[PDB]
């Protein structure tokens, strides 16, 4: 088949509706809960949050089977999770042959492409009243596997698709389906620090920003204006975000350009608006309570992975 002559994957991305409204839609940011069944495989954009994705790993799309005797190749095709190999020689020269010399396979001629899974979880403000939200799975392949990391706003795009499960063989009525979705593109409203590069407009943004002046105290003014005053502490948070400067000893040590801050004080005065604005704006952000699951939930877990036997 022509699939092993392909030196190119494809990964779509849908429109942003800003252009669909130009000249006049189809796929809005949707829920884990608002599938409505009929949206299997239709074109879609889901938001939410990624809890846990496994590591990228390889998976066949096309076999390379060669003959010992005929010296010719065979192309065994799989799209399932599984297959059964091809051992006896059904070759084309062995067809016109008494003896049927055994064939075997390759480790390089045989096509490959990776396969990685990810779990969305639902956004809070769109859960209806009193309702415990629910989960979902996606499958990805190949190139875009590296554009996903847990803890972020996301707008996955693609298509929601089925697969073979029926429950577990007693609580059944037939035709039942476990399911998944296709990954083709990632946008996220949170731009991590390592995606930065200047251009002919964002440099203009920084320009017109710096042009006004008073830039330092202006920043520490714009930090969470919902709450009153104490510019000295808004400034200290700004500096916590900066972190500092990394320096290396070059003798087997470095030292952090990193900050650590505290705001002791009595109640009544505002305390928490700060932290919530912080984790609102800063990426790679985190809130915790004080007590509850502090035993290990601030710490490293141990878990087996669904899609592959491994101790992650």
């Amino acid at each position: 088949p022509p699939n092993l002559t392909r030196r190119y994957f494809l990964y779509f991305k849908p429109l942003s509706q800003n252009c669909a409204r130009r000249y006049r839609i189809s796929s809005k940011p949707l829920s884990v809960r608002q599938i409505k069944g009929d949206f299997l495989g239709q074109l879609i954009t889901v938001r939410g949050i990624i809890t846990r994705v496994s590591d990228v790993k390889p998976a066949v799309e096309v076999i390379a089977y060669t003959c010992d005797q005929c010296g010719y190749e065979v192309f065994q095709e799989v799209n399932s999770r599984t297959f059964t190999p091809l051992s006896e020689c059904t070759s084309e020269e062995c067809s016109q042959n008494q003896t049927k010399g055994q064939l075997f396979m390759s480790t390089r001629a045989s096509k490959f492409s990776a396969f990685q899974e990810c779990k969305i979880q639902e956004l809070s403000q769109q859960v209806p009243v009193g309702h415990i939200p629910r989960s979902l799975n996606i499958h990805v392949n190949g190139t875009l596997v590296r554009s996903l990391s847990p803890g972020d706003i996301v707008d996955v795009t693609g298509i929601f698709l089925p697969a073979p499960y029926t429950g577990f063989k007693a609580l059944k009525a037939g035709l039942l389906t476990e399911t998944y979705l296709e990954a083709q593109f990632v946008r996220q409203h949170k731009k991590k620090f390592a995606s930065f590069s200047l251009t002919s407009d964002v440099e203009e943004r920084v320009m017109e920003l710096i042009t006004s002046g008073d830039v330092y105290n202006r920043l520490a003014k714009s930090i969470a204006p919902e709450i009153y005053g104490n510019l000295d502490v808004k400034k200290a948070l700004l500096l916590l975000l900066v972190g500092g400067v990394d320096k290396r000893v070059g003798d087997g040590m470095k030292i952090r350009g990193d900050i650590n801050v505290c705001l002791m004080g009595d109640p009544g005065v505002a305390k928490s608006q700060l932290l919530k604005a912080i984790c609102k704006i800063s990426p790679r952000g985190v809130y915790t309570t004080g007590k509850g699951s502090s035993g290990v939930g601030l710490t490293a877990a141990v878990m087996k992975d669904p899609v592959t036997d491994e101790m992650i």
Binding site: K57, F112, S113, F115, S149, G151, F193, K247, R248
Partner: protein, 641 residues
């Protein structure tokens, strides 16, 4: 033209170019890489090795990068290493007997024609862990750096498929064909024709040796949100009993893929291929840190000897640097220059740093005929104000020491310190995991915040501070093991901001005996005054003044390398036996200092004998006792209260 299918690799041209590079390589990389006497870099290996009868050889990548005619060989051994090496194992015998032509020899030629040869490319182009290996670049020469968790037993594999016919007093034989066996069902038609009558025996057949190793990956860069992975691989025969728990490693190999079964029941398989690595060479040592005790590991040495595998166990030396060492030891500013050189980025902390270095010498490792052992390790404590380089010192030592683990606070337990038992995710069987205590068996065991630790975790170190032996009695496991690691750790004060006028043997939130049995402690009070503060200020600022502190090399500081190698030769070749003069100055020292127990006796001797090891004496002396008791009373600051 000669060429391989799907390949751009010639046999004989590779042989010729190999040979010409081989006849022509004379420290070229010193010239072309950089600015840095000798001649024919490689050829000496190949001249020397013959009389010693060894079928191995090591090899760089850079020397191909240096020589002219090897730049294309680089990308080809890279892509087709087992193929390029199936070539070179032949090109090597070819070059051998093309070089013997200029020589007349006693008849050693009964062997080399019967011989094989193999290579080991070790120092190669860097690779970024595991994540980089998207499937584009599977099955390629690769390099990595990390440490060990778990070792399996030996996989055998059919290597000669013996076959017993049922009749006609006839055996049969057949070998493996890309990793299978196709039993000949027939019965050797001529003598007897029974088209499926034959049997199989194992005790005849030839077996391979294969082993698998769990490894922890220790990169130099990671992305935003990273965490450890645990990878398996495969080594094969003549490499067995080399790499195990307690070792950091730089390594090489080949990344590959493989599927697995759905069951023990039929041939239905997985769309996704489990990955792995096959092994090409391992690097057990390096430059930026010293090596194992040469006494500890004797049985392993003589085993590798008997096995005729000689991949490294100890770094080797030069005589010109031996002389360099006997020169550098002649001067008398050792006892301070070592100190100034341990930590140029830091202020004085003289006795502190000196004690660090003396533990890095360790001391004495004696045994008795059957009923004694006394080990070179002295358990160390620190205490005093925060806001100093205590933690920095400790990170530094944990780096620079080869065999050691770091612990913090109350997040640790006896279970995760002595043996614990678990299950494999692949085999689903009951396999164990070694403990962080025993992993450092020989070297460093580092802790921080000793005070808040659980009394359950603090209960175990009663015995480790004496015998270097943990014991276990839990599920299916009964064995008292060895944990020769040393202890080196911080304590924090009682309360905060200190209490100058109080018995500091009570001012810690820590009881007496635990503290008294430490061989030595160091104290980090503040004593605020200029002439110690401004100097430190510039001392730490001029670090920041540069992008990295090379102009810290001023004020007489050594490099790490001559230092570490001097240390290693010291650690590995001298044995100071105790002397008579030191008795009368040690005894009175201990007794008069009692005015708090007998362990500081053992501390003084195990540290003064290290003072003797330093200066490269094969004897202790009275004087070592002097600085010993001196610096002890300086440590706890005898004069104040």
């Amino acid at each position: 033209l000669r060429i391989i299918w799907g390949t751009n690799v010639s046999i004989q041209e590779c042989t010729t170019n190999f040979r010409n590079f081989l006849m022509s390589f004379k420290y070229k990389f010193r010239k072309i890489l950089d600015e840095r006497d000798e001649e024919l870099y490689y050829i000496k290996q190949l001249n020397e090795m013959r009389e010693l009868g060894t079928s191995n050889l090591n090899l760089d990548a850079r020397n191909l990068l240096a020589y002219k005619q090897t730049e294309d060989l680089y990308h080809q051994l890279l892509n087709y290493p087992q193929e390029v090496i199936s070539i070179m194992d032949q090109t090597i015998k070819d070059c051998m007997v093309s070089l013997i032509v200029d020589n007349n020899l006693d008849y050693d030629l009964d062997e080399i024609e019967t011989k094989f040869y193999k290579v080991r490319p070790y120092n190669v182009g860097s690779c970024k862990g595991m994540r980089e290996l998207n499937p584009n670049d599977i099955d390629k020469l690769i390099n990595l750096k990390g440490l060990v968790l778990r070792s399996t037993p030996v996989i055998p594999d059919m290597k000669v498929a013996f076959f017993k016919c049922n009749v006609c007093d006839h055996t049969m034989a057949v070998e493996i064909d890309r990793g299978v066996i196709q039993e000949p069902a027939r019965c050797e038609r001529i003598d007897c024709n029974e088209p499926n009558s034959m049997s199989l025996i194992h005790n005849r057949c030839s077996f391979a040796d294969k082993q698998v190793i769990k490894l922890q990956e220790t990169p130099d860069f990671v992305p935003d949100g990273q965490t450890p992975h645990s990878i398996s691989l495969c080594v094969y025969d003549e490499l067995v009993d080399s790499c195990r728990a307690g070792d950091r490693i730089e390594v090489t190999g080949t990344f590959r893929s493989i599927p697995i079964r759905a069951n023990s029941r039929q041939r239905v398989l997985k769309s996704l291929y489990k990955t792995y690595v096959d092994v090409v060479h391992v690097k057990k040592v390096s430059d930026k840190r010293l090596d194992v005790d040469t006494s500890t590991i004797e049985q392993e040495l003589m085993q590798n000897k008997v096995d005729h595998n000689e991949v490294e166990e100890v770094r080797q030396i030069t005589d010109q640097d031996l002389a360099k060492i006997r020169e550098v030891a002649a001067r008398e500013d050792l006892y301070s220059l070592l100190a100034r050189s341990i930590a140029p980025s830091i202020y004085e902390l003289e006795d502190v740093k000196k004690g660090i270095l003396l533990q890095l010498f360790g001391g004495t490792n004696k045994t008795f005929t059957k009923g004694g052992r006394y080990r070179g390790d002295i358990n160390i404590l620190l205490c005093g104000d925060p806001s100093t380089s205590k933690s920095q010192i400790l990170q530094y030592v944990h780096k620079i020491t080869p065999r050691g683990v770091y612990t913090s606070g109350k997040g640790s337990s006896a279970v995760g310190l002595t043996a614990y038992i678990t299950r494999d995710v692949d085999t689903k069987q009951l396999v164990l995991e070694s403990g962080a205590l025993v992993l450092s068996d020989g070297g460093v065991c580092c802790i921080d915040e000793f005070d808040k630790m659980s009394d359950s975790t603090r209960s175990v170190l009663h015995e480790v501070m004496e015998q270097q032996t943990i014991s276990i009695a839990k599920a299916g496991i009964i064995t008292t093991l060895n944990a020769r690691s040393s202890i080196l750790a911080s304590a924090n004060p009682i309360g905060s901001r200190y209490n100058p006028n109080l018995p500091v043997t009570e001012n810690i939130d820590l009881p007496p005996p635990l503290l008294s049995r430490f061989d030595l402690v160091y104290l980090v009070l503040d004593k605020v005054d200029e002439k110690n503060d401004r100097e430190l200020a510039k001392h730490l600022t001029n670090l920041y003044l540069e992008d990295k502190p090379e102009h810290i090399s001023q004020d007489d500081v050594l490099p790490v390398e001559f230092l570490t190698m001097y240390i290693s030769y010291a650690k590995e070749h001298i044995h100071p036996i105790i002397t008579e003069a030191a008795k009368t100055e040690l005894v009175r020292a201990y007794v008069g200092m009692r005015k708090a127990t007998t362990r500081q006796l053992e501390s003084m001797i195990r540290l003064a004998e290290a003072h003797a090891k330093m200066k490269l004496k094969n004897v202790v002396e009275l004087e070592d006792v002097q600085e010993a008791v001196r610096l002890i009373r300086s440590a706890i600051k005898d004069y104040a209260t």
